[PDB]
Amino acid sequence: KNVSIIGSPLAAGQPLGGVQLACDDLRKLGLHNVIDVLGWKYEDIGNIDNCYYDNIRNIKEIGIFSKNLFDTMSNELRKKNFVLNIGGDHGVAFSSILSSLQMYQNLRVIWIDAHGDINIPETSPSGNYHGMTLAHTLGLFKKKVPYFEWSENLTYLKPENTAIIGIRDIDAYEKIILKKCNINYYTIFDIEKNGIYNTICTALEKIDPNSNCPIHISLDIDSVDNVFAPGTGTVAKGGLNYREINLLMKILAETKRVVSMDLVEYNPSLDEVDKKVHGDSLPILDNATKTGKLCLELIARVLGYDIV
Amino acid sequence: KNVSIIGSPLAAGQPLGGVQLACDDLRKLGLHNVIDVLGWKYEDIGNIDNCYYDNIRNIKEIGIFSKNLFDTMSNELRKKNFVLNIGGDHGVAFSSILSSLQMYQNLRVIWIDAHGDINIPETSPSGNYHGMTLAHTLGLFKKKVPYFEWSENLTYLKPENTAIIGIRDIDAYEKIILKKCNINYYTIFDIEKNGIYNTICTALEKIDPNSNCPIHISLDIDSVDNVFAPGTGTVAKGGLNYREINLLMKILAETKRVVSMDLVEYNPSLDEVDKKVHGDSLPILDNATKTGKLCLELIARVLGYDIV
Amino acid sequence: KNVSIIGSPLAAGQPLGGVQLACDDLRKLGLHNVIDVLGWKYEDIGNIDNCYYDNIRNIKEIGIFSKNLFDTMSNELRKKNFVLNIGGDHGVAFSSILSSLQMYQNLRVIWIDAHGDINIPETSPSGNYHGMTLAHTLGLFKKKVPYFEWSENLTYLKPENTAIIGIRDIDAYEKIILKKCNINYYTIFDIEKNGIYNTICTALEKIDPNSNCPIHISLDIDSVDNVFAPGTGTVAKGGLNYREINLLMKILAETKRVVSMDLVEYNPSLDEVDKKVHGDSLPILDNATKTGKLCLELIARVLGYDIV
Numbered sequence A, B, C: 001k002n003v004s005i006i007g008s009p010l011a012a013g014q015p016l017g018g019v020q021l022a023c024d025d026l027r028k029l030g031l032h033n034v035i036d037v038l039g040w041k042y043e044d045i046g047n048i049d050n051c052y053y054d055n056i057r058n059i060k061e062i063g064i065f066s067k068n069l070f071d072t073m074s075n076e077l078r079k080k081n082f083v084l085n086i087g088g089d090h091g092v093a094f095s096s097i098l099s100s101l102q103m104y105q106n107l108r109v110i111w112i113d114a115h116g117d118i119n120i121p122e123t124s125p126s127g128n129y130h131g132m133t134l135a136h137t138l139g140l141f142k143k144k145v146p147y148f149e150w151s152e153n154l155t156y157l158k159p160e161n162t163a164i165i166g167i168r169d170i171d172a173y174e175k176i177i178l179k180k181c182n183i184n185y186y187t188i189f190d191i192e193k194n195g196i197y198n199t200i201c202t203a204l205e206k207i208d209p210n211s212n213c214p215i216h217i218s219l220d221i222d223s224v225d226n227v228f229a230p231g232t233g234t235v236a237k238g239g240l241n242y243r244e245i246n247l248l249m250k251i252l253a254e255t256k257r258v259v260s261m262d263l264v265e266y267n268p269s270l271d272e273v274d275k276k277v278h279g280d281s282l283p284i285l286d287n288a289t290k291t292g293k294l295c296l297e298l299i300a301r302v303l304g305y306d307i308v
């Protein structure tokens, strides 16, 4: 029951600033108090500081940042702590997943997101890296990436060992990439047809038939509907509701096999207040903005927080 | 993959004006671009222009309009195009369904609505025709209708070949008519108990056991909850949510047997903006009002639009 | 088909005033007209007027009020009327349940609530009685309660004959009490996993395997999500939605075994307007505040109100 907290305030994977403030905002809202009350011990490492493709925006900053995060997280993982990586945009998942994968070769990744993030630079509509991060992590890039030389000899994630859950906003080329690489995916329609519980059980059974693999959760908060999670840069209608995302995290916690996690794309500057209702019982700051509060509750779920 | 577009801006079936603007509003919002991107070809026919019961309001206008729509739609159906009929209030479904039925004698009708629209003139609380249209289409009227003489020798729809889905606001007399005529109906409670997916599968199995019949979809947008579809005249609490209505249209598309469709009761003057989120990816006008945008997305679903 | 209406405007179980106005507000909104239209006859009894634990707030007022309610309700129950007890805060359920239990020894109680209300005075964070009422009713109090001497020789409710449904906001000590006393409980997560329909069927099968016991419903309106029921003092995120709470009441009605019911924690002063949509068809006042209107609709469900 030891968790290493890493702040990864990288905002170079997408147009906006805001996500760089997420790590410190979650601390201000009561991250430490929340971990404390759940009976976990924490070590807060602070914040990470900061032939070829020529069409990825801000790639130098991203590459340099990613090397630092990779080295820092590798060191935390070796402690056999649960490692919590708080972004930052989804670009931080590359170093997070790959560092975890080098240590846990049989890692299974649950990528929770409204989007695929599975564009490659030659298909990206935006040139924004956070929309390509999963494709990069899966070894789908065809050329070398500037400032990622340090990563060229790493073992990459395999599509068959991955499940994407909650998707609903996929680009034309992405649809082809998704089908082609044979990754396991579960759309909001699958969730509507079968329910979130059956969906995650199906995903876990598919990627971990013997229920014996370590799990990495990469949670993009925009997987959650705008009604509950307005504090995020790229919104897609018809997301996971409050009950669903909480149950999902609870089920993953109950595997007892989660070793690491990203929580990405929380943007405090975009967030809104409700606020304070009696049900906000975790030691979270009164009247906190709703997405920030949700983030802390979802982290609590992963650490074992339950209704009774 | 050819669709005929018919605009049927009839607003005489209910008190309000507004629905007469729906057809041109959906065009303005990008109907043609949406059809184009889905790989369909369209032919836009433009807009329809315009002993006995003595208690149906505006019946002359409705009767004259309906003859025109019947003749126009009959001509489009004979092309073997998919025919998309955009209202207008639900009154336009009489000529739509009956023209389709004369060509496709084994037509099965899916009537998606918060309401039954199954009043007869002697039971109607309002005298508004759009609340009687289904009863009229099913041959339940007991007397002749002024200005509907042209229709008297048509074959009418049979209750056993029809399923009503999403109902929740039914008048006292309607409850009796519904049970008496033995139509297949699936209330919002059936949907809550079994889910939208099981519900539509059950309905399709009930009316088309051999999965070999052409299907007509009559979609009243007020079947969808007010949160997602405020742009409509008669709202009923507890409607289909965004995920449900999208999944429903997707499942119907996947039968590959839909030959015609109404989209009715969209009233732009009542609609609201969100607006523009990244997930609005179809070539729909930026910041479009939400019900109009939903209408275009649901039309896209019927034309094969899917998440991946 | 006779219902006795008892108004129990007790507001001493929790900090706020407001719930004392609930009984008269529901009457103003059309309680009598609603009962009339459903084919029931009513008798409106009006409103109840008004070694030891030393740490329960306002306990004198509560104790004196409860004796009056117990005596009044006992008299109504003996008529073999369905008895509808409208609070007031949840404190009124003690006398309601116990009076019903003395007459119906095999009573089964369905406690619908976001909260457990299962604190004992030595574990209560607030000293507010409405957060202890279920624990008191179940005979879990260890010391005597001032001004409750009249109740000391009553038969108490048994945990195994009770089901709590909808819970999501439980205090640390309550979690232990819940598990220890072996009460049947169904959290919002159970509801999300299985659906409200399966959940209530499971609960009824568990507490009444032979489907032959009289049922008491204790409905705290804060079980319903804030979106639909803002008019209440203690809100918890992720509640029952509009469709779910309506279906739940419908299923309980359909047992044909409900003999009594509480509707508690409605606070008109906290309520909001929508308002008037066509679907508000029950004889409820136009533009009524939404929680009040919901309360009347849920009472109607229990009295047999259905979609068709």
Ligand SMILES: N[C@@](CCCCB(O)O)(C(=O)O)C(F)F
Residues within 6 Å of the ligand: A090, A113, A114, A115, A116, A117, A119, A124, A125, A126, A127, A128, A130, A131, A132, A171, A220, A222, A234, A265
């Ligand atoms: N696919 C998009 C957006 C990706 C969203 C990133 B996220 O998961 O928060 C891209 O940039 O490649 C495209 F539409 F712009």
Ligand SMILES: N[C@@](CCCCB(O)O)(C(=O)O)C(F)F
Residues within 6 Å of the ligand: B090, B113, B114, B115, B116, B117, B119, B124, B125, B126, B127, B128, B130, B131, B132, B171, B220, B222, B234, B265
């Ligand atoms: N049944 C009502 C309303 C019908 C709603 C039409 B719709 O489906 O949009 C009627 O007019 O017969 C009645 F309550 F007024």
Ligand SMILES: N[C@@](CCCCB(O)O)(C(=O)O)C(F)F
Residues within 6 Å of the ligand: C090, C113, C114, C115, C116, C117, C119, C124, C125, C126, C127, C128, C130, C131, C132, C171, C220, C222, C234, C265
């Ligand atoms: N458990 C609480 C609140 C109870 C809510 C009562 B209700 O069901 O409306 C208590 O007072 O014991 C605590 F957190 F303050």
Ligand SMILES: [Mn+2]
Residues within 6 Å of the ligand: A090, A113, A115, A117, A130, A220, A265
């Ligand atoms: Mn992402």
Ligand SMILES: [Mn+2]
Residues within 6 Å of the ligand: A113, A114, A115, A220, A222, A223, A234, A265
């Ligand atoms: Mn995303």
Ligand SMILES: [Mn+2]
Residues within 6 Å of the ligand: B090, B113, B115, B117, B130, B220, B265
């Ligand atoms: Mn209609």
Ligand SMILES: [Mn+2]
Residues within 6 Å of the ligand: B113, B114, B115, B220, B222, B223, B234, B265
């Ligand atoms: Mn309707």
Ligand SMILES: [Mn+2]
Residues within 6 Å of the ligand: C090, C113, C115, C117, C130, C220, C265
């Ligand atoms: Mn309560």
Ligand SMILES: [Mn+2]
Residues within 6 Å of the ligand: C113, C114, C115, C220, C222, C223, C234, C265
């Ligand atoms: Mn409560």
